[PDB]
């Protein structure tokens, strides 16, 4: 069961600058003290990325954006709102769908023919009587059809929390769909109370190389909502989406083998 809970507010997306964000490791070999030059899909430096945030002010929005040859994702996180994505092409009808998800202990990756409603969300229910919180809710897809791929692993979205003060959990992701391989890159960085993509550098680690071999053109991001008894609303979230383009970078490697800075 799904329901038309749109309450969508239209506002222009505030383009903001990332300041040298979106670079990852191009190859699976350990260099050091070198200036290796590479040509791959990268987010260009000082580029406009789309600040999307549907919370604060019962403002809820979760539109379908195209997967134009590369997606950079960021999710400055406070109370675990961004839970996964539903990459695809039509996100409905008779086509192939991908439902990358991060639940409380694992990562479920499903390439399947799901049928989708207009407003997908992951609903967590809390009981007075049992107090257990369970994800046993499914409203992004009504049912499944001819299902093809399943994958269970350690979740991508990782807490990495326990430290105090003003640092924040900035989680960065890179999605790309070259010839039949779905590659996911990530890194998580503490940030000292910044209300913008931080001015530093990032080293996005490889996570999965999924053998999917699908079209995909309409990537979308899942959120999680509590139950309450304005039905099914809750949280606080803000995330940032930018697109990768075929570019050429020059990376300088430090003595630990990790990159220091990248010159576009």
């Amino acid at each position, epitope marked *: 069961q799904c329901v038309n809970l749109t309450t969508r507010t239209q506002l222009p997306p505030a383009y903001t600058n990332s300041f040298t964000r979106g670079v990852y490791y191009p190859d699976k070999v350990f260099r050091s003290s070198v200036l290796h030059s590479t040509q791959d899909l990268f987010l260009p430096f000082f580029s406009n990325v789309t600040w999307f945030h549907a919370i604060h002010v019962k403002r809820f929005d979760n539109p379908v954006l195209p997967f134009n040859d590369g997606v950079y994702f960021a999710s400055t996180e406070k109370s*675990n709102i961004i839970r996964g994505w539903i990459f695809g092409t039509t996100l409905d009808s008779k086509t192939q769908s991908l439902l990358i998800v991060n639940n409380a*202990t694992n990562v479920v990756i499903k390439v399947c023919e799901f049928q989708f409603c207009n407003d997908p969300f992951l609903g967590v229910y*809390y009981h007075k009587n049992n*107090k257990s919180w369970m994800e046993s809710e499914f409203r992004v897809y009504s049912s499944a059809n001819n299902c093809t791929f399943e994958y269970v692993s350690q979740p991508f979205l990782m807490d990495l929390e326990g*430290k105090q*003060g003003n640092f924040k959990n900035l989680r960065e992701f890179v999605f790309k769909n070259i010839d039949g391989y779905f590659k996911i890159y990530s890194k998580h960085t503490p940030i000292n109370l910044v209300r913008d993509l931080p001015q530093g550098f990032s080293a996005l680690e490889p996570l999965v190389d999924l053998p999917i071999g699908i079209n995909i053109t309409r990537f979308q991001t899942l959120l999680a909502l509590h139950r309450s008894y304005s039905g099914w609303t809750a949280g606080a979230a803000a995330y940032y989406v930018g697109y990768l383009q075929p570019r050429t970078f020059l990376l300088k490697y430090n003595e630990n083998g990790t990159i220091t800075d990248a010159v576009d």
Partner: antibody
Amino acid sequence: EVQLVESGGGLVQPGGSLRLACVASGFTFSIYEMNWVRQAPGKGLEWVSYITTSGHARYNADSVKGRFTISRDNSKNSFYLQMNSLRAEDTAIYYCARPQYHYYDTSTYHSYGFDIWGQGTMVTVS
Amino acid sequence: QLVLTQSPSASASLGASVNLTCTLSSGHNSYAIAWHQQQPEKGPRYLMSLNSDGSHTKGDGIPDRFSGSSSGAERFLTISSLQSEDEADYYCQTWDTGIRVFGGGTRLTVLG
């Protein structure tokens, strides 16, 4: 009801291996990560190790001399301190406690401090 | 990490008021704490997780008597109108990057 019951005592020379457990019921294990705290007889309580909800482990606190290991069995709804190499100082109460930060949380993160505590077990070791 | 300069022995009359003090290392000035009271021959009891502004999150069975305040890099727990049950060990603890320190005890020999 939240409760943290333990078992697995035994008397061994330092370097011996035992089987320690902290069984619980009445609440979700999937969204609660667990810590361990050590309290020598007449001494102050001291944490030793913990496991996260995902499955990552932290053998920190530098009182564990590479002797204690932590795991969790989400399938059987139980929590074990994967135990080997007991040593002389390990004769103590082993209160297993439950951090306040469940994975589906709101408000400020004034959590990861224990809201409830186990009854503790005495594992005499010499 | 933070060290507790909590007096090994502090005391006052029953029904009076005292303030225990939890001192914290200068490196983590804005860090929050939570207080656990260890009555003898029993288990730990969590009272409050004290914010830097003195706000309350309360455990069961704890009156409005037990309150916390903050000033600078140190912290307070307030007790007013002391009674018999106050004779216990008080522990001040913290959070870190996978470290919980827990400090030491506050053995309080309140005469009354």
